[PDB]
């Protein structure tokens, strides 16, 4: 055998892996949370985009906090031995560190903990991608004119917005982040490493979108997504 390199994740397992999409649109009246118009556009775009990357996509709609936790636990208990990776997409209201079930909040840590290197052995050493369209607080960006491994290793959080900030969703077109993410994956998944795809997503969101509102507080605002990588290798969707 000739010289070997191992700077990239093995992505030629029999299966690419699961893509779990949690699409929360309608919230229990008692929570006072608004309906997330446009989120079905995001969910459909993600389903198609990841289907074409050969992920086994599962779409779930309007899950309570209990259902989110049980789904995640159950998924983490599957045998992923034949799968290259794992993807989870969360579309909901949020605050920093939190995603909302239809009836209340869920700690993101609680969700991702199920997939720790020591808790999901069939995903140990494989990339676990969490893609999140949700607010991280209420700040608005005004813009400016121009041998063991760590249990937290091999996670990537592709967050729609910077820490502390709102995240923007268009009721007609879908969210700025998800529409940009799907576009860049479609265009570049067969050509670029995933961090570089996400960097193009950052640029697209930052340059092509700006809010329009009759409310001065919410008008003319900008957004930058936030790539959080604990990955240990380059990730290419092809092989």
């Amino acid at each position: 055998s000739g010289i070997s390199l191992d700077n990239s994740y093995k992505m030629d397992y029999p299966e690419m892996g699961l893509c779990i999409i949690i699409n929360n649109k309608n919230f229990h009246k008692s929570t006072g949370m608004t309906s997330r118009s446009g989120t079905d556009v995001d969910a459909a775009n993600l389903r198609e985009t990841f289907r074409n990357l050969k992920y086994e996509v599962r779409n779930k709609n309007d899950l309570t906090r209990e259902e989110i936790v049980e789904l995640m636990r159950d998924v983490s208990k599957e045998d992923h031995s034949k799968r290259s990776s794992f993807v989870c997409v969360l579309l909901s209201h949020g605050e920093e560190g939190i995603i909302f079930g239809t009836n209340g909040p869920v700690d993101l840590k609680k969700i991702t903990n199920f997939f720790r290197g020591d808790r999901c052995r069939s995903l140990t050493g494989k990339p676990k991608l969490f893609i999140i369209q949700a607010c991280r607080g209420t700040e608005l960006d005004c813009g400016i004119e121009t041998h063991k491994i760590p249990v937290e290793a091999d996670f990537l959080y592709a967050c729609s917005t910077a820490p502390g900030y709102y995240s923007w969703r268009n009721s007609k077109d879908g969210s700025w982040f998800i529409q940009s993410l799907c576009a860049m994956l479609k265009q570049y998944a067969d050509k670029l490493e995933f961090m570089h795809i996400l960097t193009r997503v950052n640029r697209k969101v930052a340059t092509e979108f700006e809010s329009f509102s009759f409310d001065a507080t919410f008008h003319a605002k900008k957004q930058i997504p936030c790539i959080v990588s604990m990955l240990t290798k380059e990730l290419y969707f092809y092989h």
Binding site: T34, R36, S37, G38, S92, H93, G94, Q133, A134, C135, S160, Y166, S167, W168, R169, N170, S171, S175, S211, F212, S213, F218
Partner: peptide, 4 residues
């Protein structure tokens, strides 16, 4: 445009 709406916020999440």
């Amino acid at each position: 445009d709406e916020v999440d």
